[PDB]
Design a binder for this molecule. Structure first.
Ligand SMILES: [Mg+2]
Ligand SMILES: [Mg+2]
Ligand SMILES: [Mg+2]
Ligand SMILES: [Mg+2]
Ligand SMILES: [Mg+2]
Ligand SMILES: [Mg+2]
Ligand SMILES: [Mg+2]
Ligand SMILES: [Mg+2]
Ligand SMILES: [Mg+2]
Ligand SMILES: [Mg+2]
Ligand SMILES: [Mg+2]
Ligand SMILES: [Mg+2]
Ligand code: NI
Ligand code: NI
Ligand code: NI
Length: 198
């Protein structure tokens, strides 16, 4: 019953967060995205990181395009999510340029990811990750994260705590609108090291 009461709060907050996000102008999204991009490029953990995981942005997410360009300009090794829609399973798969993203097939969420027969280098098979940019519907200032309900990123973060002597740095990119007072969590949810916004 306590488990269910947590899920209910998470579900209620998602709907509340999604309404706010849907109500944002396209040009305001692009604006905070530009503010976060510049903040990320200045960020010391980003500048030091050599192997990176970043997400490809949905319409209700901070746009990562300018970050991805910077990543490749600085010769960083770039990995992106490849979701296995059957379960809460994802890997991080290597892409070799920003332009490759444009030719990839898309999922039912209209997000690019290498297809089923496209054999990719997975981050955890070649040394893990220094830095993971974390998407999500909401974050609080304690680093608690509210995902979309599937727990892909919670599960993946636990996997990185195998393989890696030193865990990845986890950097969430959030609209000011996604910043919450209290994000409902259970013992299974994974905090992020830092939430960027403004
Ligand atoms: Mg690092
Ligand atoms: Mg956007
Ligand atoms: Mg699938
Ligand atoms: Mg992997
Ligand atoms: Mg390739
Ligand atoms: Mg496509
Ligand atoms: Mg996984
Ligand atoms: Mg709140
Ligand atoms: Mg979570
Ligand atoms: Mg937590
Ligand atoms: Mg923090
Ligand atoms: Mg701030
Ligand atoms: Ni897999
Ligand atoms: Ni190659
Ligand atoms: Ni608090």
């Amino acid at each position: 019953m306590a488990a269910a009461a947590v899920s209910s709060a998470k579900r209620s907050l998602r709907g509340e967060l999604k309404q706010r996000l849907r109500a944002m102008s396209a040009e305001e999204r692009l604006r905070q995205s530009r503010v976060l991009s510049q903040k990320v490029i200045a960020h010391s953990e980003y500048q030091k990181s050599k192997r990176i995981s970043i997400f490809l942005s949905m319409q209700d997410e901070i746009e990562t395009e300018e970050i991805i360009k910077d990543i490749f300009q600085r010769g960083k090794i770039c990995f992106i999510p490849r979701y296995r829609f059957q379960s809460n399973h994802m890997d991080m798969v290597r892409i070799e340029s920003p332009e490759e993203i444009s030719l990839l097939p898309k999922t039912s969420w209209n997000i690019p990811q290498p297809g089923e027969g496209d054999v990719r280098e997975e981050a955890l098979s070649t040394g893990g990750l220094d830095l993971i940019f974390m998407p999500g519907l909401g974050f609080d200032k304690h680093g608690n994260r509210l995902g979309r309900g599937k727990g892909y990123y919670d599960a993946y973060l636990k996997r990185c705590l195998q393989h890696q002597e030193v865990k990845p740095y986890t950097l969430a990119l959030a609209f000011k609108e996604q910043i919450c007072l209290q994000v409902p969590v259970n013992e299974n949810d994974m905090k992020v090291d830092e939430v960027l916004y403004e």
